[PDB]
Amino acid sequence: MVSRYVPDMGDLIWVDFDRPAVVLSPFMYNNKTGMCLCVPCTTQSKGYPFEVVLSGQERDGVALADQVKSIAWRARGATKKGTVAPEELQLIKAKINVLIG
Amino acid sequence: MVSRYVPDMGDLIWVDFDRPAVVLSPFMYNNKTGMCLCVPCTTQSKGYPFEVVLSGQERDGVALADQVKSIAWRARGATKKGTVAPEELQLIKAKINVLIG
Amino acid sequence: SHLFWAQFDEYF
Amino acid sequence: SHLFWAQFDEYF
Ligand code: NA
Ligand code: NA
């Protein structure tokens, strides 16, 4: 069996850098480059302008949209934990767009 | 003298991670968080969809817009080397926006 | 954009 | 967007 998981947008993955992360880039990109864009999650909701609270009960369930980073997802050990809700993914993207200007 | 350089958008900085980088985030953000968004530069132009060739003659003068990353600019030693042209900065941002979707 | 950065400044 | 990803696919 040769096929293996490749992150897709909206995936919540366990990764060694920025442990939970939300994938923003699409499968077509992630499958060809070995990289994906992702946003790290942390524990505490603070009302920080760039945070997005994720539904569910996970320990690290606040995404920090401003700390987006390209990561080499194979080398960092990306394992899929689940997904975020579409509305959460869209709020993350909107906040990054504001930062990029 | 207490004031020190804080990156601003369009700055080309020498940084220890992703050596030359283009700053995308604005001073108001960079000055409060200790972080900025930046894109790494590399040597070779390949026609890669996410590359943006920078004017000038520097060794690492091709920005890889898809490898944007939040960096802790003080800890990575950000020193200003110069600037990129406005049109180059706008092409980088547009390419990141496509990746974010 | 303008609303967002107003709120950011206010937060900090 | 559509043009861009067409070009990306073609490149690879
Ligand atoms: Na595949
Ligand atoms: Na200052």
Q: Do the chains contact at B98 and D1, CB–CB below 8 Å?
A: yes
Do C and A make contact via 3 or more CB pairs under 8 A? The reply is yes
3-class state of residue B52 by DSSP? strand
Contact list in D for residue A28 (CB cut-off 8 A) is 5, 8-9
How many residues are recorded in chain A?
101
Nearest in space to B92 (alpha carbons), one of B58, B61, B51, B55: B51
Touching chains, B (3+ CB pairs < 8 A): A, C, D
Q: Apex CA B47: angle with CA A92 and CA B19, to 5°?
A: 65
* Residues in contact with A56: Cβ distance below 8 Å, sequence separation at least 6, in sequence order: none
- Residues A60 and A54: their CA atoms lie apart, in Å, by 9
Q: Between B18, B29, B101, which is nearest A99 by CB?
A: B29
CA dihedral A40→A43→A49→A50, nearest 10 degrees, is: 10
Per CATH, the architecture of B11-100 is what?
Roll (2.30)
Q: Using CA of residue B10, residue B12, residue B15, residue B20, what is the dihedral sign?
A: positive
Residues of A in CB contact (< 8 Å) with B are: 9, 18, 24-26, 29, 33, 35, 37, 66-70, 93, 96-97, 99-101
How do the domains of chain B map onto residue ranges?
11-100
Assigned CATH topology for domain A11-95: SH3 type barrels. (2.30.30)
User: Parallel, antiparallel, or unpaired: how do β-strands B35-42 and B11-14 relate?
Assistant: unpaired
Interchain CB distance below 8 Å, B29 and C8? yes
Identify any residues that bridge with B69 across adjacent strands, giving them in sequence order: A69, B38
**Which residue is it, tokens 């990029």?**
A100
